[PDB]
Terminase DNA packaging enzyme small subunit (Aeromonas phage 44RR2.8t), 957 residues
Amino acid sequence: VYAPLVLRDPVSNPNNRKIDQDDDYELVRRNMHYQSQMLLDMAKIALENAKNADSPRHVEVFAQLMGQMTTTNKEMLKMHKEMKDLA
Amino acid sequence: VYAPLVLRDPVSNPNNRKIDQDDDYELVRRNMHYQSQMLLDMAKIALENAKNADSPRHVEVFAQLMGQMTTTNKEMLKMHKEMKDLA
Amino acid sequence: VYAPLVLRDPVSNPNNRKIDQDDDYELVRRNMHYQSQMLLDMAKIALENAKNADSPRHVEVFAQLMGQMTTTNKEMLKMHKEMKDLA
Amino acid sequence: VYAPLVLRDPVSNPNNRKIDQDDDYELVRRNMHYQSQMLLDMAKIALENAKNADSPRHVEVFAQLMGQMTTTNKEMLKMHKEMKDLA
Amino acid sequence: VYAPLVLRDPVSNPNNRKIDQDDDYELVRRNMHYQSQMLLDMAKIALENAKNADSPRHVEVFAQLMGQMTTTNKEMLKMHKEMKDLA
Amino acid sequence: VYAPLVLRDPVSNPNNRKIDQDDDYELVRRNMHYQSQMLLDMAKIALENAKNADSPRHVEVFAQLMGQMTTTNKEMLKMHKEMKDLA
Amino acid sequence: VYAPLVLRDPVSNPNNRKIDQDDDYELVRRNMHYQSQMLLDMAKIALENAKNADSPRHVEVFAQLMGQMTTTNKEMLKMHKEMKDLA
Amino acid sequence: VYAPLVLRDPVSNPNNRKIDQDDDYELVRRNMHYQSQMLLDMAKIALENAKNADSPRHVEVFAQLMGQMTTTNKEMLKMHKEMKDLA
Amino acid sequence: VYAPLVLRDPVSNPNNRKIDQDDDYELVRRNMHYQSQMLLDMAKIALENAKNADSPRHVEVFAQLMGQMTTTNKEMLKMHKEMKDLA
Amino acid sequence: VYAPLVLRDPVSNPNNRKIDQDDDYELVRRNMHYQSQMLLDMAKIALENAKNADSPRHVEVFAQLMGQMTTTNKEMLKMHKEMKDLA
Amino acid sequence: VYAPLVLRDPVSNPNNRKIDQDDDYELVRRNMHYQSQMLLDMAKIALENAKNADSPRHVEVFAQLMGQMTTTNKEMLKMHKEMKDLA
């Protein structure tokens, strides 16, 4: 059994948004960094399995993994463009 | 049996819309933060399950979460853009 | 056997639209809030479900909930843009 | 066995449009209000079903309900913008 | 055994289109009125069926109904916008 | 065995196109009227079948008809708009 | 066993394309006429089949033809736009 | 068992492409005529099959042909527009 | 066992890219031609299979070839527009 | 057992990115060429396999290959536009 | 059992974003290089498998790898365009 997740409620500032923006930027960027670490970690293992299992499903799912890995990396640069337009 | 949800009813102000805008912004940001925590929590477990199972399904399902985590990230920054246009 | 729903016919003013807008915005904002309340209640349960039993289907279904939760968050802020344009 | 539907035929005015617009606006708004009642009625039940019967299908189908409930909400606001567009 | 449908040929005027527009407008608006009646009649029954069945299929199919009910009601007002553009 | 169809090759005039435009306008308007008459004939039967079958499948397909009834209606008004555009 | 098709090479004029255009228009229009006839033929039979038998498939299949019949009609008008643009 | 295809390598002109354009024009047009001939050949037969074999699959797949036959006719006229664009 | 493919590494000129362009043009065109030859070869065989075997699958898959054959034809002319824009 | 892949880290220069562009251009073009060789090599074999097996699946998958072969071919010339835009 | 991943937190500077862009550009270019390497490594093995084992699945799955390989290349040169528009 896993311990239930305690949800942490952020402090929002509707009339002073720039500080919400700054924190959210840090959070998004952290997450994108976690994602790429996770994806790469998964890819290395997924690759060797797909090479050795000699089964089309392994290869098909590896292709889906790559598709996602590209989407993630694509977004990291898109983030800075969204930030530039906000500032 | 789980406890039935008791629906909470918001106070709406059509003629004084900004009160609503502020509160709705605080909720949306709160939710998005919840979303990113829930996704992260699940991601870490789904990653380890996929690595040790040698099952394409587990990898596929991990990719789906990453897909969702990315969309969640995209929409956090797009939220601030909508606020900038509203203000 | 559940009690059959009794439909509630609203009063509409084609000649006096503004009173309808406000009432409909009151209703829409209510439903929006209800939806986030429902989604969050389900997300918490679905997350623990997905974590406890090694079952990709539960993980897959949790992802879909996040996807739907995100779409509902998006529209809450787009509602305010729709109202600003109307006035 | 249910009683067959008896179709009511409306009166159309091709060269005096505004009369038709006003009447169709009343119908559209009525239908949408019924729709949001039906959806909310099902949502509450489908939510408690999805929580209690530990099976992915119930959650998946609850997600599709929320998607449809969101889409119906969007169109209630867009209805009014369609009206403002018409002179 | 139902009675074979006898197709009724309309009268067309390529060089006096105004009479055709008006005729086709009366037909389209009539059909959209029939659809909304038919769908609303279906939704009442489909709702109660999905409430008492305790099976995802019924809920799934009710959602599909709601989606089509939405599309129909949206195109009713869009019909007018097309007519305004024609005149 | 149903009677084989005998295909009817029309007369075409690339250098004197206005004759063809008008001739095809009548064919299209006729076909659209044929479509609408057929769909309504089917709709009335499909509806009562669905109402009394207590089967999700029947509702699903009825929702498929309405979507097709709506699409045919849309293209009828737009047929005139395209004719307006042709000088 | 049916007689194999013997393919007929068209005469093309790369530097004097107008006679290619004219013949290709005469082929396209012919083919579109052939299509609307084949669909109407099929639809007449498909409708009666979907009436006499209480069978969702036959309805579903009838709807798909109407969908295809609407698109064919749409493209016939859109053919006269492309031909107008080429001249 | 069929004879293996022998691939015919074309001669290209990077710096005098007008010769390439013309040849490629004759090829594409040839292949479009080939396609419309082939599709009509299939349709004539598929329609009779769909009429006689009391199985929806025949009608569903016939509809797919019609969709495809429409698509192939759309691009015949779009070819000439593209050829016009190439000055 | 087929003979493993040996990857032939091309020579690229980053700051003399026009040579690479011309080389790539001849390669792309060679392949476009190979494609239309392979598709047409397959289509002649697929057409007769579909006609004689009286199976919806054969008709369905034949339609997919044509769909793909139409696409290859499209890109062939679109290649020349891309070349025009590059020079 | 296949040999594990050993990932080679590139050398990145954020300040003087022109060197990186050129290297990546060589990489991209090289890989696009590989891709073109790999598709062709497969196409030859799949084509004959589809012709002789008399099974829809083989023809279906051949069509899929061709669609992918066209996408690859399309992107080779679009690559040169991308570089011209960066120049 | 594989060793659990340890997530590494980056340092983000919301009001000194250039440091972040440079580091992220390096990371994204590293990952895109990793992806192309992984995709090529899989493609080589998938190619021979598809050729040697007469099975449509292996060919289908290979095509999916190629699609994903093409997308990755596309995105490598877009990365630079994205960096150019940031400067």
